[PDB]
Amino acid sequence: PSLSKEAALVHEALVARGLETPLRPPVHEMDNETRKSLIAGHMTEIMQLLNLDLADDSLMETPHRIAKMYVDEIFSGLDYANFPKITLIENKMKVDEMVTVRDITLTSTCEHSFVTIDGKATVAYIPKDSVIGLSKINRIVQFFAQRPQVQERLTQQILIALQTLLGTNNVAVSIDAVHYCVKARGIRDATSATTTTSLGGLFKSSQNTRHEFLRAVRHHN
Amino acid sequence: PSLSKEAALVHEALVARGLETPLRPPVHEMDNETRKSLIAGHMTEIMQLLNLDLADDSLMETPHRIAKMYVDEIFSGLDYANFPKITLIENKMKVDEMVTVRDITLTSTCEHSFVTIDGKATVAYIPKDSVIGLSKINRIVQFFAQRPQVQERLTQQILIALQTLLGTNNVAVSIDAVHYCVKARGIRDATSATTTTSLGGLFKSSQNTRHEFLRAVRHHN
Amino acid sequence: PSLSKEAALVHEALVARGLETPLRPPVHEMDNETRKSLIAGHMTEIMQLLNLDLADDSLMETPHRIAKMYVDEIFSGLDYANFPKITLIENKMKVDEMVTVRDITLTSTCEHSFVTIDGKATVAYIPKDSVIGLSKINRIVQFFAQRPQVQERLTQQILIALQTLLGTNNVAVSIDAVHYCVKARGIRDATSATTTTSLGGLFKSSQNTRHEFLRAVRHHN
Amino acid sequence: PSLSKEAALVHEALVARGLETPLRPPVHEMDNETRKSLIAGHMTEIMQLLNLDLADDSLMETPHRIAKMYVDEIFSGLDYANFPKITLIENKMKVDEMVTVRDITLTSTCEHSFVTIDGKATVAYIPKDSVIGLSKINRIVQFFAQRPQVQERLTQQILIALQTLLGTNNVAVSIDAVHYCVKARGIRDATSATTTTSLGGLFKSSQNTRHEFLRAVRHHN
Amino acid sequence: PSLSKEAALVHEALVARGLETPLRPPVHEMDNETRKSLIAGHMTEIMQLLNLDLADDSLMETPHRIAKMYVDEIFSGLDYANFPKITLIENKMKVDEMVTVRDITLTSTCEHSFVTIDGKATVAYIPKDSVIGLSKINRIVQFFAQRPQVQERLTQQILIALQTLLGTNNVAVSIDAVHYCVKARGIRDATSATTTTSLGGLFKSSQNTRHEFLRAVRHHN
Ligand SMILES: Nc1nc2c(ncn2[C@@H]2O[C@H](COP(=O)(O)OP(=O)(O)OP(=O)(O)O)[C@@H](O)[C@H]2O)c(=O)[nH]1
Ligand SMILES: Nc1nc2c(ncn2[C@@H]2O[C@H](COP(=O)(O)OP(=O)(O)OP(=O)(O)O)[C@@H](O)[C@H]2O)c(=O)[nH]1
Ligand SMILES: Nc1nc2c(ncn2[C@@H]2O[C@H](COP(=O)(O)OP(=O)(O)OP(=O)(O)O)[C@@H](O)[C@H]2O)c(=O)[nH]1
Ligand SMILES: Nc1nc2c(ncn2[C@@H]2O[C@H](COP(=O)(O)OP(=O)(O)OP(=O)(O)O)[C@@H](O)[C@H]2O)c(=O)[nH]1
Ligand SMILES: Nc1nc2c(ncn2[C@@H]2O[C@H](COP(=O)(O)OP(=O)(O)OP(=O)(O)O)[C@@H](O)[C@H]2O)c(=O)[nH]1
């Protein structure tokens, strides 16, 4: 057992564009359970440097939980084994029409401060020879989202990934997000949100389809 | 007593495009109440395999209800005898005007998992030689919706159906829908929805009428 | 005492287009109070054929009310004597700019089943040599609405009526409506509404003024 | 002491287009308090002819109030001495940007029935050689509004006045209003509102700037 | 130590366009704390001339607070030492697509009357060779907001500043604001709001990108 076919095509398409998240070569595969205990040991050190009482039955289990978050939960997208099982249906229908999946739940983490990014993604495409399974779009968005991210990079990764799998450039990706390092810290902007949009094919070059997406982006319920 | 003229034209039109829902030869005719008792019998087996007590006063009538649902209710659009009796008014008013029927109640079932699809349809057309009865648009939408469906196929079926009966390519169909196999299971995206839009004639080729529909797409109340 | 000047120009402009609601020649003039008693008598028979107790102090006055409604109230627009007294001010200001009267209360009745149509109208025009009085637009919409109507014909009757009175083709009429024969009966579509738009002049031919109206159509409060 | 420079340019610009009363030779006449006493006297007569008890301590002061209203309050826009003191800042910013002042409180009276007009104005312009003081746009709208008005004329007066003061044709004025002579009387349309828009310069001729304004027109809060 | 590189490049770019004051001080080295006591002394005199009792435990500390506000807080943007530490990420991604930061908290002051301006800023740009850090856009808007401003000037100061740092003309700035010198005094317009928009590069010249921003401007939550 290794990786997957669709995971490989996406990975190589992204490396070819320099869109991979800053990752150094694996070298050796240390035990997953050892990684957690070492990170937990390092977080125990951090908390003691901040004058926190680890003798308390609540702050005691915290280093274990931060470690379990880093390795098995929030950064699961760095491992291509967690890549969704892509299912493409043959365009028997000759669908020359558009599909838009709006308000996709996007949960990420800013690579600059390891703080939460709450977002919504809108993906639209025009089927060429294949129609992707609906949930797979939500799963691709979430795969790249669960990584230490940069919103502009993230938007591109999702675009190129969908472009590769569908064999069409006619894909559009928009991510409307709130970065908590902007909101709950620093400038403390309680009302601002960032939208980063990547247009491809007809959504870019042709004037027509460019305005067909951009207007239908930003929806509430 | 057999079928209907309008139902025949639509059927032939969809078959010619490869849009007729995956159906195998119906060579024989087994009694309607026999198919319900057999499906009920098969559902009684499924429930026993799930460790559910069928001796309970409410779980007891469940296999008969799922049987009655599949045969007489939710999949009624598989039978062209249930096709709406279309009324066409002759356009002696000669109007080159646009009619849009939005927020059409659409109740379907995903063919991939037999789970609920809650949706809303938007149909727009420019009358040529005939004006269709308003309710028949709502009924056509629902006829094709009461089938094990794929959202992209459903949209095209309603388009081609309305294009055939009205004798114009000038028809636009958009379906906004929530798939419960996406929302209440799997990826569990509580916020996402999918819009599939089929543009034909002036709504497709001509630049003007394309943005006339797409802007008036998705309205709330 | 006969009819009106403005009523005549409109009537003949609509007859020349085949837009006047399908009516047969009146031949003789039958007493208005006799037509009520006749209709009331026919409704008393309909109610009897439905097992209703006419000896009841409430259902007793119902035939009289439905008679009063059909002759003096809801169908008053079939009588051109009820046509609004139109007043036009000369364009001394040389106004080559637009006027839009949105959310006009439209109360009609479907010709198909004599059931209530609840609508809202949006009328826009560009004054040429005359500016029409504001309430006269509301009254024109209501004159043609108080008739057994078809939404597509209703929209056109308002359009041509306004076009004739203003001496310009630069008029746009849009009616957004809920038909209770679609909502509270048959298909029972609780959420759907129908929008019928008739564009004229620059709102039709010219690309610019076309999307000036259509965008500012469908407003809530 | 007489008038003002800014009041004079606007006055003649409007007279030149038939939007204002031409300046006639300086007469002289009544004392402002004699005008009120005479109007109050005529209102006392009107109320007597309507069988109202003027001996009651409430309806007693009504003729005096309607008199004060007509002379000093609601029609103060008829006297150019009440014209706002306009301040123009030299554009050595040299900016080719656009300024939009929306939802400007507009309180008028229809000249047809002396009944209240509740409106909201939206003004946009592109600075050429000068930038007008913000509040002055609101004050100009209110100057022309406090008069017996016609919505279409009111829109043109504000347009030309702003065009003259700014030395640019690049101004757009839009008034969204509810006439109470349409709402609380006659047709009794409780839902309608009228929008009258005047476009000049690039907001008219150029297709680009035309849709820049008209889209950002009609905002709530 | 004294200033910043990115601060100097922006200052220079603004002086070159007449949007800033030529940096000429050090003044006669007035101690930060003596400027406060002198301003507090001048405000004590103003309050005395308005006949307010300074012996009251509440009004006593007011001159000190207004001084502290003027010197250390609300006018902090007049000193380029307070300019944010800009971070530019190299465009490794070759991203030819857009970033929009909407609903930016903007807190300013009427240069005309020293009164509060409550605003929201919307900044958009297409990254050329650099991607600026998200919070920096918020921080730049607030730097220029924290000084006695003129909204049309503020909008441009932000545009040019971002155009300079990013090395692109493709930047769009829109400020939506409520001036309390218009709302709570004078004309007393409780509902008006002023939007000032500055479009550069593709957002101005090219017709596509101009309508991509202006449509996505003015968002609530
Ligand atoms: N373009 C972009 N910038 C990001 C993203 N995430 C974080 N940033 C920005 O990168 C910058 C980090 O700059 P630094 O100078 O280290 O300062 P900081 O303390 O992190 O940020 P502030 O204190 O908030 O100004 C900030 O402007 C963050 O807002 C992201 O996805 N895209
Ligand atoms: N294009 C399209 N895909 C659909 C439609 N209905 C269901 N699907 C997708 O078809 C896929 C089924 O792929 P499978 O690999 O069998 O996975 P699954 O367990 O059924 O679905 P998920 O767990 O939700 O990914 C999913 O991506 C569904 O969301 C539909 O109308 N159109
Ligand atoms: N185009 C149009 N159709 C209308 C209008 N009013 C009613 N109709 C349609 O005319 C049709 C009546 O066709 P029938 O075959 O008599 O059916 P019905 O039982 O009266 O109506 P349903 O039960 O709702 O299908 C329906 O499709 C109505 O919705 C109207 O103003 N315009
Ligand atoms: N175009 C325009 N029409 C206006 C304006 N103010 C009033 N009117 C219209 O002028 C007309 C008055 O016409 P009349 O024949 O005297 O009727 P009325 O009894 O005064 O008014 P209604 O009963 O409401 O028709 C109406 O249509 C009003 O709505 C205005 O500012 N612009
Ligand atoms: N264009 C612009 N005008 C501004 C700005 N700030 C204040 N103003 C305007 O400059 C004018 C000040 O004119 P003045 O004649 O001194 O009157 P004022 O008493 O300050 O203001 P008002 O009583 O509100 O008319 C007003 O119209 C203000 O609204 C601003 O940022 N931009």
PDB file of N, CA, C and O and ligand atoms in Angstrom, chain B residues 85 87 89 131-136 139, chain C residues 110 112 149-152 179 181-182 185-187, ligand 3:
ATOM      1  N   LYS B  85     -50.529  16.908 -18.120  1.00  0.00           N
ATOM      2  CA  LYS B  85     -51.346  17.161 -19.292  1.00  0.00           C
ATOM      3  C   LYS B  85     -51.101  18.617 -19.687  1.00  0.00           C
ATOM      4  O   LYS B  85     -51.697  19.540 -19.129  1.00  0.00           O
ATOM      5  N   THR B  87     -50.954  22.133 -21.647  1.00  0.00           N
ATOM      6  CA  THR B  87     -51.842  23.045 -22.363  1.00  0.00           C
ATOM      7  C   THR B  87     -50.986  24.175 -22.952  1.00  0.00           C
ATOM      8  O   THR B  87     -50.211  24.820 -22.233  1.00  0.00           O
ATOM      9  N   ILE B  89     -51.071  27.668 -25.249  1.00  0.00           N
ATOM     10  CA  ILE B  89     -51.898  28.768 -25.758  1.00  0.00           C
ATOM     11  C   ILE B  89     -51.172  29.304 -26.993  1.00  0.00           C
ATOM     12  O   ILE B  89     -49.959  29.527 -26.956  1.00  0.00           O
ATOM     13  N   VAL B 131     -47.289  29.709 -25.795  1.00  0.00           N
ATOM     14  CA  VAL B 131     -47.118  30.101 -24.398  1.00  0.00           C
ATOM     15  C   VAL B 131     -47.642  28.908 -23.579  1.00  0.00           C
ATOM     16  O   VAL B 131     -48.818  28.543 -23.693  1.00  0.00           O
ATOM     17  N   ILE B 132     -46.769  28.297 -22.775  1.00  0.00           N
ATOM     18  CA  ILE B 132     -47.142  27.157 -21.925  1.00  0.00           C
ATOM     19  C   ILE B 132     -47.888  27.624 -20.660  1.00  0.00           C
ATOM     20  O   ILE B 132     -47.674  28.743 -20.167  1.00  0.00           O
ATOM     21  N   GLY B 133     -48.772  26.762 -20.159  1.00  0.00           N
ATOM     22  CA  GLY B 133     -49.517  27.054 -18.948  1.00  0.00           C
ATOM     23  C   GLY B 133     -48.546  27.078 -17.785  1.00  0.00           C
ATOM     24  O   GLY B 133     -47.711  26.175 -17.650  1.00  0.00           O
ATOM     25  N   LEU B 134     -48.632  28.132 -16.976  1.00  0.00           N
ATOM     26  CA  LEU B 134     -47.733  28.324 -15.835  1.00  0.00           C
ATOM     27  C   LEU B 134     -47.459  27.125 -14.946  1.00  0.00           C
ATOM     28  O   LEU B 134     -46.308  26.714 -14.847  1.00  0.00           O
ATOM     29  N   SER B 135     -48.519  26.494 -14.429  1.00  0.00           N
ATOM     30  CA  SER B 135     -48.389  25.333 -13.535  1.00  0.00           C
ATOM     31  C   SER B 135     -47.703  24.144 -14.166  1.00  0.00           C
ATOM     32  O   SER B 135     -47.058  23.383 -13.465  1.00  0.00           O
ATOM     33  N   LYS B 136     -47.811  24.014 -15.493  1.00  0.00           N
ATOM     34  CA  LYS B 136     -47.198  22.893 -16.215  1.00  0.00           C
ATOM     35  C   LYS B 136     -45.679  22.938 -16.137  1.00  0.00           C
ATOM     36  O   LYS B 136     -45.038  21.891 -16.179  1.00  0.00           O
ATOM     37  N   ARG B 139     -45.031  21.485 -12.714  1.00  0.00           N
ATOM     38  CA  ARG B 139     -45.306  20.042 -12.830  1.00  0.00           C
ATOM     39  C   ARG B 139     -44.218  19.274 -13.616  1.00  0.00           C
ATOM     40  O   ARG B 139     -43.845  18.172 -13.213  1.00  0.00           O
TER      41      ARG B 139
ATOM     42  N   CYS C 110     -57.356  34.945 -12.252  1.00  0.00           N
ATOM     43  CA  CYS C 110     -56.981  34.078 -13.380  1.00  0.00           C
ATOM     44  C   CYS C 110     -58.211  33.765 -14.232  1.00  0.00           C
ATOM     45  O   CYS C 110     -59.266  33.447 -13.684  1.00  0.00           O
ATOM     46  N   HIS C 112     -58.522  31.362 -16.237  1.00  0.00           N
ATOM     47  CA  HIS C 112     -58.566  29.924 -16.233  1.00  0.00           C
ATOM     48  C   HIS C 112     -59.456  29.294 -15.160  1.00  0.00           C
ATOM     49  O   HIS C 112     -60.169  28.324 -15.456  1.00  0.00           O
ATOM     50  N   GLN C 149     -57.879  37.608 -16.184  1.00  0.00           N
ATOM     51  CA  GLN C 149     -56.616  37.709 -16.905  1.00  0.00           C
ATOM     52  C   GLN C 149     -55.672  36.541 -17.079  1.00  0.00           C
ATOM     53  O   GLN C 149     -55.773  35.506 -16.413  1.00  0.00           O
ATOM     54  N   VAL C 150     -54.744  36.776 -18.008  1.00  0.00           N
ATOM     55  CA  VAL C 150     -53.634  35.903 -18.354  1.00  0.00           C
ATOM     56  C   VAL C 150     -52.470  36.880 -18.131  1.00  0.00           C
ATOM     57  O   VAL C 150     -52.468  37.968 -18.721  1.00  0.00           O
ATOM     58  N   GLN C 151     -51.494  36.489 -17.299  1.00  0.00           N
ATOM     59  CA  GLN C 151     -50.342  37.342 -16.942  1.00  0.00           C
ATOM     60  C   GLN C 151     -49.534  37.904 -18.122  1.00  0.00           C
ATOM     61  O   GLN C 151     -49.205  39.092 -18.148  1.00  0.00           O
ATOM     62  N   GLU C 152     -49.333  37.076 -19.141  1.00  0.00           N
ATOM     63  CA  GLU C 152     -48.576  37.453 -20.331  1.00  0.00           C
ATOM     64  C   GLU C 152     -49.281  38.499 -21.183  1.00  0.00           C
ATOM     65  O   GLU C 152     -48.629  39.364 -21.786  1.00  0.00           O
ATOM     66  N   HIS C 179     -50.038  33.101  -8.355  1.00  0.00           N
ATOM     67  CA  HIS C 179     -51.331  32.608  -8.822  1.00  0.00           C
ATOM     68  C   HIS C 179     -51.781  31.586  -7.787  1.00  0.00           C
ATOM     69  O   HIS C 179     -51.067  30.602  -7.516  1.00  0.00           O
ATOM     70  N   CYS C 181     -54.049  29.463  -8.018  1.00  0.00           N
ATOM     71  CA  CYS C 181     -54.499  28.242  -8.657  1.00  0.00           C
ATOM     72  C   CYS C 181     -53.293  27.313  -8.808  1.00  0.00           C
ATOM     73  O   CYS C 181     -53.445  26.124  -9.082  1.00  0.00           O
ATOM     74  N   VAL C 182     -52.104  27.866  -8.562  1.00  0.00           N
ATOM     75  CA  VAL C 182     -50.831  27.132  -8.614  1.00  0.00           C
ATOM     76  C   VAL C 182     -50.361  26.866  -7.169  1.00  0.00           C
ATOM     77  O   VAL C 182     -49.766  25.818  -6.884  1.00  0.00           O
ATOM     78  N   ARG C 185     -53.780  25.193  -4.816  1.00  0.00           N
ATOM     79  CA  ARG C 185     -54.498  24.157  -5.551  1.00  0.00           C
ATOM     80  C   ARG C 185     -53.563  23.435  -6.526  1.00  0.00           C
ATOM     81  O   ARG C 185     -52.452  23.903  -6.802  1.00  0.00           O
ATOM     82  N   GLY C 186     -54.017  22.275  -7.003  1.00  0.00           N
ATOM     83  CA  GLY C 186     -53.282  21.478  -7.970  1.00  0.00           C
ATOM     84  C   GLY C 186     -51.891  21.044  -7.588  1.00  0.00           C
ATOM     85  O   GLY C 186     -51.731  20.166  -6.731  1.00  0.00           O
ATOM     86  N   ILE C 187     -50.894  21.727  -8.164  1.00  0.00           N
ATOM     87  CA  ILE C 187     -49.481  21.415  -7.912  1.00  0.00           C
ATOM     88  C   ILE C 187     -49.055  21.827  -6.510  1.00  0.00           C
ATOM     89  O   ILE C 187     -48.078  21.299  -5.987  1.00  0.00           O
TER      90      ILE C 187
HETATM   91  N1  LIG F   3     -49.363  31.283 -19.304  1.00  0.00           N
HETATM   92  C1  LIG F   3     -50.446  31.380 -18.274  1.00  0.00           C
HETATM   93  N2  LIG F   3     -50.883  30.166 -17.894  1.00  0.00           N
HETATM   94  C2  LIG F   3     -51.868  30.368 -16.960  1.00  0.00           C
HETATM   95  C3  LIG F   3     -52.303  31.523 -16.499  1.00  0.00           C
HETATM   96  N3  LIG F   3     -53.299  31.171 -15.578  1.00  0.00           N
HETATM   97  C4  LIG F   3     -53.503  29.847 -15.416  1.00  0.00           C
HETATM   98  N4  LIG F   3     -52.552  29.385 -16.326  1.00  0.00           N
HETATM   99  C5  LIG F   3     -52.241  27.936 -16.623  1.00  0.00           C
HETATM  100  O1  LIG F   3     -53.202  27.280 -17.443  1.00  0.00           O
HETATM  101  C6  LIG F   3     -53.243  25.845 -17.107  1.00  0.00           C
HETATM  102  C7  LIG F   3     -54.683  25.190 -16.868  1.00  0.00           C
HETATM  103  O2  LIG F   3     -54.463  23.950 -17.659  1.00  0.00           O
HETATM  104  P1  LIG F   3     -55.579  22.754 -17.319  1.00  0.00           P
HETATM  105  O3  LIG F   3     -55.235  21.656 -18.196  1.00  0.00           O
HETATM  106  O4  LIG F   3     -57.026  23.259 -17.361  1.00  0.00           O
HETATM  107  O5  LIG F   3     -55.308  22.313 -15.777  1.00  0.00           O
HETATM  108  P2  LIG F   3     -55.871  22.793 -14.385  1.00  0.00           P
HETATM  109  O6  LIG F   3     -56.401  21.617 -13.573  1.00  0.00           O
HETATM  110  O7  LIG F   3     -56.824  23.887 -14.523  1.00  0.00           O
HETATM  111  O8  LIG F   3     -54.511  23.341 -13.637  1.00  0.00           O
HETATM  112  P3  LIG F   3     -53.392  22.520 -12.751  1.00  0.00           P
HETATM  113  O9  LIG F   3     -54.219  21.547 -11.923  1.00  0.00           O
HETATM  114  O10 LIG F   3     -52.807  23.487 -11.840  1.00  0.00           O
HETATM  115  O11 LIG F   3     -52.385  21.881 -13.696  1.00  0.00           O
HETATM  116  C8  LIG F   3     -52.300  25.712 -16.008  1.00  0.00           C
HETATM  117  O12 LIG F   3     -51.019  25.330 -16.438  1.00  0.00           O
HETATM  118  C9  LIG F   3     -52.325  27.049 -15.231  1.00  0.00           C
HETATM  119  O13 LIG F   3     -51.323  27.223 -14.392  1.00  0.00           O
HETATM  120  C10 LIG F   3     -51.891  32.677 -16.856  1.00  0.00           C
HETATM  121  O14 LIG F   3     -52.101  33.894 -16.596  1.00  0.00           O
HETATM  122  N5  LIG F   3     -50.773  32.585 -17.918  1.00  0.00           N
END
